[PDB]
Amino acid sequence: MGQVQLVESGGGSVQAGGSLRLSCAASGDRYCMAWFRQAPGKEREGVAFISTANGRTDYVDSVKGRFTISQNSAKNTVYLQMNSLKPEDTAMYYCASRGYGYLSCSSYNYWGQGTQVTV
Amino acid sequence: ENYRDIALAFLDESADSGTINAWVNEFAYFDPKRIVQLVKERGTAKGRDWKKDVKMMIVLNLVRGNKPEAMMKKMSEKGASIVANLISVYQLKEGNPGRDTITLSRVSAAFVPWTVQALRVLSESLPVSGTTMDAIAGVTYPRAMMHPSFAGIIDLDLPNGAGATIADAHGLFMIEFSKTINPSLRTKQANEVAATFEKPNMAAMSGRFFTREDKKKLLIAVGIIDEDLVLASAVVRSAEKYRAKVG
């Protein structure tokens, strides 16, 4: 039982060059939302994030331009539009909402269960 | 092996003054309630108007810093005699505080409800003048925000993120304050200076010495928010000019 609970969705198997949409439903709480991924064997890395006020958004260098993070402030949900998927994008994707206002790129807090995509 | 010879070899090992002082700066020390009790108890035990002394220790901390022994060497005998008095009765120290240590910075922090009203009068006499902050932000920067102790009255849990907006607006001053007192940070970027203070400044905002309702009334009286919790225009514009420096 946690003050904040995250549930990711939308993960699946997609051929190279395709595109799928991840959604994350938040519950319990204003924060900067970040998508992380961890390929099997490798370390978990940051993919995307958007600021609290929705003005600033930033993506990691490998997926910049290809991925698009957004949120519906009404439905309290975060989306991760991933286009032009590559075999290297095969990983389990997670969501986070660490710290509070001041910085923008915290590292490693509440997490979801994650969702797996395979390319 | 012989262990006496092992410990003896430390006589012939570097006691570098530069590296030693670097290790002690990182292993650094907070405490609001006990600072108030120690000031009142030691002030009345010496039969002083400790209330008046708190006001003087606050104003002295705002205009000269946290090194009482150092500022006393560049001050008139009139002021230097009052400094020596307050150092004796309250056992003031130069920084790096302990559990029962009283510093000029900790006095301004624990007694911040008066610091926030002295900022209304001292904006032009601070290390970073109020007109300078009026130039960094596109408006008249709230005088209530021109000292780190203001973070002790910031409720991040205020609705619509205004507590985080006030924090962001406060940070626009914090970066320039840190650049002035630490010359090595004057060549760093805005986000590099931000990461240097957001940890102890955060612990102040998350402090529970004041309740959410106390900080709420505190911001209303000084003009950051109103009874309807509406931020002043100077706050939101300073926050978005802070988020622009970090983003």
Numbering used by the authors:
A (entry chain B): 1 to 29, 33 to 111, 117 to 127
B (entry chain A): 4 to 32, 35 to 252
How does the study describe this entry?
Phenuiviridae nucleoprotein is the main structural and functional component of the viral cycle, protecting the viral RNA and mediating the essential replication/transcription processes. The nucleoprotein (N) binds the RNA using its globular core and polymerizes through the N-terminus, which is presented as a highly flexible arm, as demonstrated in this article. Toscana virus (TOSV) is an arbovirus transmitted by sandflies that is responsible for causing febrile illness and marginally aseptic meningitis. By coating the viral RNA (vRNA), N (i) protects the viral genome from degradation, (ii) avoids the formation of double-stranded RNA (dsRNA) between viral vRNAs of opposite polarity and (iii) compacts the RNA into a flexible ribonucleoprotein (RNP).
In this article, single-crystal X-ray diffraction and small-angle X-ray scattering were used to study the N protein of Toscana virus complexed with a single-chain camelid antibody (VHH) and it is shown that in the presence of the antibody the nucleoprotein is unable to achieve a functional assembly to form a ribonucleoprotein complex. A unique solution was found in space group P41212 with two inverted N–VHH heterodimers per asymmetric unit. In the case of a single N–VHH heterodimer, the N protein is in an ‘open’ conformation, with the flexible N-terminus extended away from the globular core of the N protein. The VHH binds to the N subdomain through an extended surface composed of several hydrophobic residues located in two side loops. In this case the N protomers (blue and orange) are inverted with respect to each other. However, the resulting multimer cannot accommodate RNA strands due to a complete inversion (‘flip’) between first-order N neighbours. The existence of these long fibres as well as the large distance between the planes affects the overall order/stability of the crystal lattice along the c axis. This leads to a moderate diffracted intensity in the high-resolution region, resulting in the reported low-resolution structure (3.8 Å). As the presence of a VHH prevents N from assembling as a functional RNP, these results demonstrate that VHHs can be used as molecular probes for the identification of sequences or structures associated with viral functions that can be targeted for the rational development of antivirals.
